[PDB]
Design a protein around this nucleic acid. Structure first.
Ligand SMILES: [K+]
Ligand SMILES: [K+]
Ligand SMILES: [K+]
Ligand SMILES: [K+]
Ligand SMILES: [K+]
Ligand SMILES: [K+]
Ligand SMILES: [Mg+2]
Ligand SMILES: [Mg+2]
Ligand SMILES: [Mg+2]
Ligand SMILES: [Mg+2]
Ligand SMILES: [Mg+2]
Ligand SMILES: [Mg+2]
Ligand SMILES: [Mg+2]
Ligand SMILES: [Mg+2]
Ligand SMILES: [Mg+2]
Ligand SMILES: [Mg+2]
Ligand SMILES: [Mg+2]
Ligand SMILES: [Mg+2]
Ligand SMILES: [Mg+2]
Ligand SMILES: [Mg+2]
Ligand SMILES: [Mg+2]
Ligand SMILES: [Mg+2]
Ligand SMILES: [Mg+2]
Ligand SMILES: [Mg+2]
Ligand SMILES: [Mg+2]
Ligand SMILES: [Mg+2]
Ligand SMILES: [Mg+2]
Ligand SMILES: [Mg+2]
Ligand SMILES: [Mg+2]
Ligand SMILES: [Mg+2]
Ligand SMILES: [Mg+2]
Ligand SMILES: [Mg+2]
Ligand SMILES: [Mg+2]
Ligand SMILES: [Mg+2]
Ligand SMILES: [Mg+2]
Ligand SMILES: [Mg+2]
Ligand SMILES: [Mg+2]
Ligand SMILES: [Mg+2]
Ligand SMILES: [Mg+2]
Lengths: 164, 85, 240, 202, 77
RNA sequence: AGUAAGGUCAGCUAAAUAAGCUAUCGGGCCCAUACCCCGAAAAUGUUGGUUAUACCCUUCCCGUACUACCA
RNA sequence: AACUAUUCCAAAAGUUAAACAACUCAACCACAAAGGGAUAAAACAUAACUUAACAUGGACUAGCAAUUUCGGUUGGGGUGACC
RNA sequence: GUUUACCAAAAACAUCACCUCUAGCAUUACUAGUAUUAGAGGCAAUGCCUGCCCAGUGACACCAGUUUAACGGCCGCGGUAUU
RNA sequence: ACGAGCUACCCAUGAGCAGUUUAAAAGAACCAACUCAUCUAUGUGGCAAAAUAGUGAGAAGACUUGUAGGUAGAGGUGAAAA
């Protein structure tokens, strides 16, 4: 494991984050850290953002996961592609890997019009699927999660409870 | 003023060494006298000023043995007479 | 014991002033520069380096002066010329062919097109033509002439870009300077000072140079023909 | 300030007597230098609101160099002495009892400053009919200007908008400061396409 | 320009005043009481010397404009 | 005198896997010679000891080399 | 070592800050663009750079220079040899 | 011309000449000067000349590299025209 | 700590070089004052802790010389004789 990417993993972990909407009704995203964590709220917000930013109801949610696919031992593990079919496939899918190996993966989850319960269930399957490559408990495998739609930005999913 | 050992080894050469404080040029404001003095101060003096929460507090709280400056004693005497009078 | 420098005169005067030799001894009294001492007694002439200097501030316009005589100055290797105008006289460095009964124009008005370059006129570098030979270069506006004053030394203007002039010093080193600095057109007088031949060891003693020491020093690594690239241009323009 | 200790031990003198000092007791060694330490921060109470720091009467742990050079000499802040803190704490009680602070939090003041000079691009797609409501307008702040806006805070001019144009939006922070920001409704563009067309070209 | 004075040859400026004179409302302690120099005591500041009775030789030269025949117009002699 | 130090095909070099070039011998090309192309032969100064030899040591022999100073 | 000169780091002073690689295969839209098939996060938990003259601490290079010695036996010492 | 005053007055040192090297510039030296200038050195007028060599060392460049009017260097063995 | 009243060099301020030969005040020439000290002989506790006698080199210059000041031992000064 190179020390350059170890610094990157330390940097992303050091990014501040806070729970809930602050006291100020209107505030800058620069001034206050990320607030949106709930998966159910995030899925509803993406559907809401579809109404706010009027587009097609069907949108492919290409989730970005800042997965810690490194720092198992002093020698880094190699990328692979584990294929596991989702319980609610969108209308076996390969798990692609970053060309730059910057510890982030872009894998489609499901369509926007799918219910939040099914999409969240697909998310839980993805979390277990990606960790199958290195299921060891020596080092954490997931650092941050960012769920973005086709016409929306990602949200910092509170993925820590869903890790086990 | 003192000596030192090169490479911090006892069996090495004995060398005369002089350590000098780093001096800075600052102008300070005193509320009692309402005048600005351009005084050669050190980083430790500024830390003591912040520790005492005031330039006037630093002069009036630190004793003679802690100040070790005739300008400081005269500065204290000027302000001490200001309060009493 | 601390000594006192002879440079105590405060008011400018054309007449020669008394001068005391040093001999390489600093104010303390120890030798600092060797091979100096025992020269012929000399008098110093007060040389006015700043070419543009009006008599009064009431009329800051350009003025024209007249050359009276060209004399020999023991201190410098060039020839100085007496110049009178208005109610004052000045000793200024004479160019290659300055003679008696001649008129010299001093000006600072930077004109757009050009100004004809005469052999004695002093004009700012912004108004001189591109291909002009200059001497008595003023490094900064109002500072005075410091560069190019030896006998036969002349610098050549190169180009004027974004209101800034670039000149070539006699050492073939480019120098950048603001175009408003005053400079003199021409070559410094006494052109054949380099071709002068000293006939005997005594003539060196008359000039004031003592003989070198007799210690035999083996040459080190510093010696030998060194080929080095020209250093970059020296610029006195302060970029904000 | 240097800190040194003697190489050779000094014999004791326990009756309040000055000990005997020898030449070998002059040999020091540098154990630590105070200028090489990672220096701390200085906490100060602000007596006037700063552009990027907190507001009038707030606690900020600013850098030590800044406090002694521009904050304290200019009167923008005062030393955070324990006696000085309670003066501001008691001062807050008077205003907040009757809701008279109107000073905003440390970030709240910066929100006003940014919104004073800002422009929002409300990108709408004409392929489907769109109606602008305060919930929609708050979305564009988060994406374009990076501003999180409460849905109730926005006060639209109450005129339904169905075509692109120029309008105004009223933004209120903490119910104390009201800011009227320019509104620019233009056709929506994909940021990947938008940045390619304009930023990459120019 | 190039002024013709030299720092060493020119008369030195007066030494800086002692720090005691800078403290408002504080009478300095000087050695003027013992009318001789003493280390550790502040240097006194004296008013300009004013001889009650004028002396011809030892007085300062009067200014040129003090002469009754002084005139603003510049005459050349 | 002492010390240093070397010998290898006819010759000069490099390796101890005794090779490379040239010379020598035989053949081809040309009117003939040389060049050139092709093929073959050829050695570890000497004695002894180095598992056994060779690069090593020893003995013999030739030749090379430095130094021989203060009074 | 000091000292002189060269270079780096630290101290000190100051300056600026919230960010870029689509391409429509279908197809909406009179345009300009659009929607489906991604438009993230992040910049760094401060960061980056400059700093005249003086000047402190810790290193690098060079100049100059400081401290101290230069074994023994030997048919006199050196040389060769020996311990 | 100069030197070991008090055992060496010289073939030694200096010297006109030639050449190399380092420096773009202000209030006490150099200098009240500014590269035809001023320092750190070598060799000795003039005349004819100053050959080859950057491997090593040193210096510069501070990287490749460049420098000997920088310190310094500037070859063996064997055969071959009657002798 | 004290010493540049001798000596090495320099900064001030002064003072000397007659005759002779040459368009010459030319680091030219003959020869005094003057300044150095080549060779030999006396002298060797001597007149002298470096001299006397004879003989010599320069003698308008990089020359002699008076007064006074400056540089001080890890240094000063030096047409290098340590
Ligand atoms: K001259
Ligand atoms: K014997
Ligand atoms: K002689
Ligand atoms: K070389
Ligand atoms: K003296
Ligand atoms: K006598
Ligand atoms: Mg001169
Ligand atoms: Mg010379
Ligand atoms: Mg010599
Ligand atoms: Mg006891
Ligand atoms: Mg240091
Ligand atoms: Mg010792
Ligand atoms: Mg020995
Ligand atoms: Mg012995
Ligand atoms: Mg013997
Ligand atoms: Mg031996
Ligand atoms: Mg002679
Ligand atoms: Mg002698
Ligand atoms: Mg003599
Ligand atoms: Mg003699
Ligand atoms: Mg020649
Ligand atoms: Mg010759
Ligand atoms: Mg010679
Ligand atoms: Mg010779
Ligand atoms: Mg040669
Ligand atoms: Mg080379
Ligand atoms: Mg004397
Ligand atoms: Mg005569
Ligand atoms: Mg003569
Ligand atoms: Mg005699
Ligand atoms: Mg005699
Ligand atoms: Mg006789
Ligand atoms: Mg004679
Ligand atoms: Mg003669
Ligand atoms: Mg003394
Ligand atoms: Mg010495
Ligand atoms: Mg001499
Ligand atoms: Mg010698
Ligand atoms: Mg000797």
């Amino acid at each position: 494991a190179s020390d350059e990417k170890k610094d990157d993993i330390e940097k992303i972990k050091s990014y501040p984050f806070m729970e809930g909407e602050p006291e100020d009704d209107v505030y800058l995203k620069r001034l206050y850290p990320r607030q949106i964590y709930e998966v159910e709220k995030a899925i509803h917000l993406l559907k809401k953002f579809q109404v706010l930013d009027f587009t097609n109801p069907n949108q492919g949610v290409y989730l970005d996961l800042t997965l810690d696919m490194t720092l198992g031992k002093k020698k880094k593990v190699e990328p692979f592609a584990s294929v596991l079919s989702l319980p609610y496939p969108f209308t076996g899918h390969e798990i692609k890997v970053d060309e730059e190996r910057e510890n982030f993966l872009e894998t489609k989850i499901a369509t926007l019009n799918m219910s939040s319960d099914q999409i969240a269930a697909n998310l839980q399957a993805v979390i277990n699927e990606v960790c199958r490559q290195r299921p060891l408990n020596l080092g954490p495998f997931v650092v941050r999660a960012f769920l973005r739609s086709s016409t929306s930005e990602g949200l910092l999913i509170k993925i820590e409870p869903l890790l086990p | 003023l003192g000596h030192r050992y090169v490479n911090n080894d006892k069996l090495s050469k004995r060398v005369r060494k002089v350590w000098k404080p780093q001096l800075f040029q600052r102008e300070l404001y005193s509320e009692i006298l309402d005048k600005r003095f351009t005084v050669t101060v050190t980083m430790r003096t500024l830390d003591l000023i912040d520790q005492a929460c005031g330039f006037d507090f630093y002069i009036l709280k630190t004793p003679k043995e802690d100040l070790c400056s005739k300008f400081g004693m005269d500065l204290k005497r000027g302000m001490l007479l200001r309060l009493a009078r | 014991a601390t000594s006192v420098s002879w440079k105590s005169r405060t008011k400018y005067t054309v007449m020669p002033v008394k001068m005391r030799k040093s001999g390489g001894r600093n104010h303390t009294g120890q030798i600092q520069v060797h091979g100096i001492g025992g020269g012929h007694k000399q008098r110093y002439r007060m040389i006015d380096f700043l070419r543009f200097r009006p008599e009064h501030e009431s009329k800051p316009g350009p003025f024209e002066e007249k050359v009276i005589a060209v004399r020999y100055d023991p201190c410098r290797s060039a020839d100085i010329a007496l110049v009178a105008g208005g109610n004052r006289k000045r000793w200024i460095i004479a160019t290659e062919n300055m003679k008696a009964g001649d008129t010299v124009l001093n000006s600072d008005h930077i004109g757009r097109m050009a100004v004809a370059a005469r052999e004695g006129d002093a004009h700012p570098l912004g108004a001189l033509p591109v291909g002009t030979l200059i001497n008595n270069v003023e490094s900064e506006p109002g500072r005075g002439a410091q560069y190019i004053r030896a006998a036969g030394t002349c610098g050549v203007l190169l180009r004027k870009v974004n209101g800034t002039a670039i000149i070539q010093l006699p050492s073939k080193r480019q120098m950048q300077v603001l175009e408003t600095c005053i400079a003199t057109v021409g070559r410094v007088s006494n052109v054949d000072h380099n071709k002068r031949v000293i006939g005997k060891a005594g003539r060196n003693r008359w000039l004031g140079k003592r003989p070198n020491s007799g210690l035999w020093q083996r040459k080190g690594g510093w010696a030998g023909r060194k080929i080095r690239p020209l250093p970059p241009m020296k610029s006195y323009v302060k970029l904000p | 300030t240097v800190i040194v200790e003697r190489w050779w031990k000094v014999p004791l003198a326990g009756e309040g007597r000055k000990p005997r000092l020898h030449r070998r007791h002059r040999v020091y060694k540098l154990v630590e230098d105070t200028k090489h330490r990672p220096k701390d921060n200085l906490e100060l109470v602000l007596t006037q609101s700063v552009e990027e720091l907190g507001v009038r009467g707030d606690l900020v742990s600013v850098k030590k160099s800044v406090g002694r050079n521009r904050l304290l000499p200019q009167g923008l802040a005062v030393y955070a002495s324990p006696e000085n803190k309670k003066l501001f704490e008691e001062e807050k009680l008077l205003r907040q009892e009757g809701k008279l602070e109107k000073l905003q939090t440390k970030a709240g003041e910066a929100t006003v400053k940014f919104l004073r000079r800002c422009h929002l691009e409300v990108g709408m797609k004409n392929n489907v009919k769109w109606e602008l409501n305060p919930e929609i307008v708050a979305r564009h702040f988060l994406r374009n200007l990076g501003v999180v806006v409460a849905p109730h805070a926005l006060k639209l001019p109450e005129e339904p908008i169905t075509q692109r144009g120029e309008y105004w939006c009223e933004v209120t922070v903490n119910g104390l400061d009201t800011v009227r920001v320019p509104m620019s409704v233009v056709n929506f563009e994909r940021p990947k396409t938008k940045r390619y067309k304009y930023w990459l070209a120019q | 320009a190039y002024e013709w004075g030299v720092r060493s040859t020119r008369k030195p400026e007066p030494p800086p005043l002692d720090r005691v004179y800078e403290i408002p409302g504080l009478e300095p302690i000087t050695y003027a009481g013992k009318m001789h120099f003493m280390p550790g005591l502040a240097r006194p500041v004296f008013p300009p010397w004013d001889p009650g009775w004028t002396h011809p030789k030892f007085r300062r030269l009067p200014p040129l404009h003090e002469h009754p025949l002084y005139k603003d117009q510049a005459c050349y002699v």
